[PDB]
Design a binder for this molecule. Sequence first.
Ligand code: CL
Ligand code: CL
Ligand code: CL
Ligand code: MG
Ligand code: MG
Ligand code: MG
Ligand code: MG
Ligand code: MG
Ligand code: MG
Lengths: 101, 102, 89, 89
Amino acid sequence: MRQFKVSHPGEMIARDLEDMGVSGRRFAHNIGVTPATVSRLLAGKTALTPSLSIRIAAALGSTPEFWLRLQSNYDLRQLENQIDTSGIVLYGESNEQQQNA
Amino acid sequence: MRQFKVSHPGEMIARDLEDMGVSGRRFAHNIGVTPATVSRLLAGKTALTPSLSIRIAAALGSTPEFWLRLQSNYDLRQLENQIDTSGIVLYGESNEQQQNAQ
Amino acid sequence: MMIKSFKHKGLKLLFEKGVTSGVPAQDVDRINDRLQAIDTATEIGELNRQIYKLHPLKEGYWSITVRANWRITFQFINGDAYILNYEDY
Amino acid sequence: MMIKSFKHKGLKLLFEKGVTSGVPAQDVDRINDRLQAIDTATEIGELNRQIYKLHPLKEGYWSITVRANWRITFQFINGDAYILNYEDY
DNA sequence: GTATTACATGGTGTGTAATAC
DNA sequence: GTATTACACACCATGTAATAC
Ligand SMILES: [Cl-]
Ligand SMILES: [Cl-]
Ligand SMILES: [Cl-]
Ligand SMILES: [Mg+2]
Ligand SMILES: [Mg+2]
Ligand SMILES: [Mg+2]
Ligand SMILES: [Mg+2]
Ligand SMILES: [Mg+2]
Ligand SMILES: [Mg+2]
């Protein structure tokens, strides 16, 4: 099934940098943003944007789409049950239409 | 390998709605957004946001993650050649450091 | 999911090189849209949109409708898509 | 990729229920981080971060490091992850 | 019943620079 | 050499309502 506990991508990166012994200031100088941006990313205050995913993949490995997928799945977990979709109709056959046919 | 031609997900939905005979106005009334938003989405002028991916999956099927992944891949296709990463250093071993160890 | 092999070489030209000479002009956009859906889907169930009319073949292959009787078929092995074909069935 | 089965029942409680009683307290966040990386990766190469120390086992199994010699192992079949384990190697 | 778009608005990511160590 | 954050700013998505059919 789905993972019960999901973390903000920046807080995962902060734990990884801690284990690697890399400061936020050095990480910011490496990937090419200001330490303010890294500090807010690692604190889970701002989202991992498409532009950051390209820079982060060049430093921490993996692909840019992997890092953006972490943020996208995390964004969807926040918006869980926050959008009323009960009034939205699925086009085509519903459950009752699929039984009669 | 990677797909050569990639479409904005809004234009994909517009081609699907046309094949289904569903107007932009009716689609907007269904998923619960104004026709202006659907118009700009279908025209590829605005992005498929996470909130839209939840509404769209409830109408067109599949999962919210699928539709958001389409926009994410499309977003990266615009940017991956626009951001200079030559100065970024990969932590760990480089190509030369992997040869010396072997 | 990764597309590993093409039986229909026109699909291969479209997916790998953006070349449209090997597929009918009427369905280039629809075909590329469904190739993009297959390439993006992480599970077979993410392709189960009612317009696609997703259903397995009678084994291990699947069918996705492009338009009318034209369909895209592929073999689902190792989480990848093999033997991609475009046929009138 | 989808995690289909767990050999280590403490990982199962953590992944499926958010229950931390089956794993060491000092590694809860790191283990969950690597479970989140496996569940998000669409290909095995997306896990090839150097801190993970990804490498095959000697067939079809893989290993990523949590901390020191503590590692997560799983079996790569059908694009999914089977027999998830957490062991001190 | 339909599609498009300027305008005002709100929400968000980023750099600058200040503060504190 | 390090981490945090108010403030200004640019960017972008959305609704309202106008226009046009
Ligand atoms: Cl866009
Ligand atoms: Cl091939
Ligand atoms: Cl199990
Ligand atoms: Mg965030
Ligand atoms: Mg249109
Ligand atoms: Mg694969
Ligand atoms: Mg307003
Ligand atoms: Mg807004
Ligand atoms: Mg400024």
